[PDB]
Amino acid sequence: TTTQSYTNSFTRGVYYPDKVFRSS
Amino acid sequence: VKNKCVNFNFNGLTGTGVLTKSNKKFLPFQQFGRDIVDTTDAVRDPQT
Numbered sequence: 567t568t569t570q571s572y573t574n575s576f577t578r579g580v581y582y583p584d585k586v587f588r589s590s
Numbered sequence: 591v592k593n594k595c596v597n598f599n600f601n602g603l604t605g606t607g608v609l610t611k612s613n614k615k616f617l618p619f620q621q622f623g624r625d626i627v628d629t630t631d632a633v634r635d636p637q638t
């Protein structure tokens with residue numbers, strides 16, 4: 567079976583929008 | 591040819607300038623480069 571408890575994601579789940587290098 | 595003003599056509603990215611070796615840290619999925627004001631600064635050689 568399974569449960570459906572709820573949690574808070576914090577600051578999480580960010581990917582690179584593009585494939586362009588960037589620094590500073 | 592490096593260190594010489596040439597017209598480049600890297601993978602359809604047309605332009606002009608002087609290209610040379612660099613010590614950037616391009617990640618494996620990276621393909622292009624850019625700066626703070628969104629101008630193409632570095633490119634990855636498709637055959638090198």
Ligand SMILES: *[C@@H]1O[C@H](CO)[C@@H](O)[C@H](O)[C@H]1NC(C)=O
Nearest residue numbers: 601618633634635636637638
């Ligand atoms: C490009 O292809 C040639 C011949 O297939 C090969 O010798 C060379 O290593 C290749 N270059 C890259 C960067 O894969």
